[PDB]
Symmetry: D2
Subunit: 293 residues, 4 copies
């Protein structure tokens, strides 16, 4: 099993992608053991990015690694098709798409045709990004099977039954979970890893949890999983997507700039409160030799 | 009470906005008694459009009428601001925004700041577009009060208690329902009207439901309301957003081109079966003398 | 349109039905204009009552009026059948049943057979009590039509579209809403009234709202509807079912004893806080001559 | 980690408990390795039973084994108290209760008081039965802590994060999952077992999934787990609660009589089609040597 980071898109103060901070971030995450980087995901604010900005993100991260899954989805299919075909000049792991978001009451038939169309033109293997809360619909194990062209799936959903079912009905599919809180459980039950936004700022924690669980030291994996769970919870207090920035700076030294409003940056006072709620944890993570400090 | 049409966006075969068919369509809608045009809503595939396309739509419909509500929201706030400010040179009813869609676990503090920011820059009255199922969050009547700058609200939700609560807590706010099925009820219960997707293809019917109910012919209004409900059900079989194009061609006799993939045009056989589902109702409407053969 | 009270079951301090307080309550509600009494509903804690206690309730209330709908549903069909047949010796309006509660994943087929079986043995007309939140399933307009034997329905649900649909698909069905907050809207849109737990303690308010709306004084109906809405809200603070007792005593003089735990009585301090939140309203209702005081 | 059977309640043709078939059934379940028997749960139609019937069930299974968890909750608290206290003369593992079902808008203050009241009178350890979908409310790990007297928890919910959180916040609490599909995962992730309805008719399989996973044969465990999932799916086609009776007769070869209407017995044709859905899986199990022809 692997840890995959849905990597943050860092922005300037005037709302452009800061390619250099993004290279620093990426450089460090690979250094610290992250298997793959999932670019333009929820944590990178892919829905808020233009097609051109989504390619910018790919190119910057490609200046560091090939271990990329390139998310190209959106509400303009011509634009997604375009990005899928542009990716042929990149030796990367694959491309990905969430389901078309926002519009409720879309037929299964239309959702299938959306994906089968991306499969027909993709130069790389295709990964499904299932996030029902965010997109309003669910490409479950059976629909993924009907589509019949996915190499892997990231299943962001609390129901691990749902996630296991992809493996049960598609035994050759790489099946990853989108939860940071299930890193331990995933490694231990026979699934292929986690796409874990929390690995942006505590990649050490996520890699260690996977290893302890790979090593069948379950009580120890759980103990660390539970500390990371408290960190996830803290980041949700002010909005996980904004907090992901403050927590990378705090835990990993470098600054990622700003999010893109309406994903508003925390203010200095929120930054401080968020720190205060994790500095006890950081202590225990250095006391546990997982963090350098 | 008003009937407001969230106007469909006609696209050309090569996925561009057909401004000429849009002008024809908006002309007919005003000629038939539609009070106002809601531009770049769900029915017009607002979230599928770029800032520049949302503006193209304002300009096309403004060469035909100035009874426009201009929907301008999105996931890049600087673009909503830019579109807000641009509308100063236009004599229109107002601007509107849905809540930021896609991202769950957004703070109330941030949702509020987003809507307040659009009020601070708006040169026209600002209308709230509440669509919890489509956007993932609920700007209910308490939050709309705390925001404090909304002239009106469109409440697309299957719960009229929730809609009534806007009038109760914001007595001077225009309160509209997003439902085609609640025209008789809204008129009859003292609310200010309906933003009805179905009035794209049957404005005569929506206008007449409202008229009867305000003439206190509650019984004929329901009678007509129930036939309209059957057309809405028809349209949902294959997806309302796509079936809306077919139903306009059929009922109003001009062609609105193509939706934007991932919103997929009905194929000829879906087109066939849909018409079969409504042709009986079209007959009834010609007999009641609401439509012309 | 009518107002129907889902009447409170009053209990002694040692957990028996207090038949005499129940007769007082019933006597008064009819005096104050209530069309019908719905016995063993949610507000009367029907699920917490044995078959024998459900007959006790019927007999007591029958010592006052025939205008009774007798709810007999439960998770033992033999017991429901028994109560349905026992009711032949009562000249009452009808019998009723919520859907079988608790167990999720029941087939439509089994839910239909439950009701068609009660219809086959009932000596009175049969009323459907649809409450999806409480029972976990929804006997919608189409399923009610399939069952094909209901004289009326009480639809407890915020979606008035859902409720209207019963009339649209079953034009001969008496269609009532379970909301206290929609009394005005129901009267005004062409439906047949409300089963309103709040009429237990402010029957004056509910009857007046209906009349003002029947009289097309919509602005005035709404104004009073909105005061009653604040009273409903207040009763939810501590648990609507327990609060219904305190509010009857306060607004109507007589005491109904206790609920049945786990529906726990309010404590003296909660009683006091609940009063404080409504005494302003009571003032305005006496100032408006709806209440005697 | 333990496999616990929520044991089916066999009824006679005239809707009485067939104690003799219940003893036979509980004997076989213990002989095949079931750790403990959960009596009067959902699978045993707990909410359909009267206090006196819940007791009849304890006594029948106690003539066979004393590894009983005795479920005693309901909507009349005095009866749950009475059943709690009665169990003092029985050498059993503990008593359990689901949260009060049916009534929505119940206060946390009241739910807590209910569970605390059963602890104050219990003569045995008390287990929490969390089934939010069936009861309408969620006693999550925070509330179970605030209550403070639970020896264990059965968490029937399709969200293992929610289940894990019990161990994290109550480290000494036995934490069980209500899912048949999560046996491999629970064993492998450090939780204490599964209360698995499916182990009524396939205890050999449930027991063997757990064994493999604890021998670290994670792969064979999933292989076997996935076949079990198909049997669970089969059982849900016509309703799990009824299909459970048919599946026991088929797999274990003794007849458990009848469920209790509104839980309706499958008719001969449903019985036929269900068997057809599983007979292929029974074959596979005889080949893997988990069952005997
Ligand atoms: O960012 C991505 O692209 C991926 C990971 C998850 O989608 C998000 O981190 C949200 O997941 P949760 O908020 O934990 O439910
Ligand atoms: O279209 C608008 O902008 C407005 C009206 C409502 O939002 C639609 O009637 C809902 O559209 P559906 O998602 O197809 O149900
Ligand atoms: O009591 C009855 O039998 C009837 C009326 C409603 O079912 C309840 O009063 C609950 O309705 P709400 O809590 O307002 O959603
Ligand atoms: O039966 C018990 O008491 C326990 C285990 C779970 O609650 C059931 O497996 C759920 O039963 P269903 O409602 O058919 O999904």
């Amino acid at each position: 099993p692997e840890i995959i980071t849905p990597i943050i898109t860092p922005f300037t103060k005037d709302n452009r992608i800061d390619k250099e901070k993004l290279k620093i971030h990426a450089e460090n995450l690979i250094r610290k053991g992250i298997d793959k980087l999932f670019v333009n995901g929820t944590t990178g604010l892919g829905p808020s990015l233009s097609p051109e900005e989504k390619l910018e993100n790919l190119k910057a991260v490609y200046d560091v690694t090939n271990k990329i899954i390139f998310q190209v989805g959106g509400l303009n299919l011509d634009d997604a098709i375009r990005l899928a075909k542009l990716s042929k000049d990149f030796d990367i792991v694959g491309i990905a798409s969430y389901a078309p978001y926002y519009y409720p009451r879309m037929s299964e038939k239309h959702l299938v045709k959306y994906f089968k169309t991306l499969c027909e033109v993709s130069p790389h293997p295709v990964y499904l990004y299932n996030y029902p809360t965010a997109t309003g619909k669910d490409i479950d194990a059976k629909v993924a099977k009907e589509i019949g062209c996915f190499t892997g799936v990231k299943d962001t959903i609390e129901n691990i039954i749902h996630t296991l079912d992809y493996k049960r009905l598609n035994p050759n599919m790489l099946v990853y979970s989108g939860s940071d809180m299930l890193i331990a459980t995933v490694a231990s039950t026979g699934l292929d890893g986690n796409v874990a936004a929390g690995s942006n700022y505590l990649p050490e924690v996520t890699v260690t949890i996977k290893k302890l669980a790979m090593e069948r030291k379950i009580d120890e994996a759980l103990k660390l999983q539970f500390l990371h769970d408290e960190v996830i919870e803290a980041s949700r207090i002010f909005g996980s997507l904004s907090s992901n920035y403050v927590l990378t700076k705090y835990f990993q030294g470098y600054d990622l700039g700003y999010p893109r409003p309406p994903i508003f940056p925390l203010d200095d006072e929120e930054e401080r409160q968020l720190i205060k709620k994790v500095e006890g944890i950081r202590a225990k993570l250095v006391e546990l030799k997982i963090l350098k400090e």
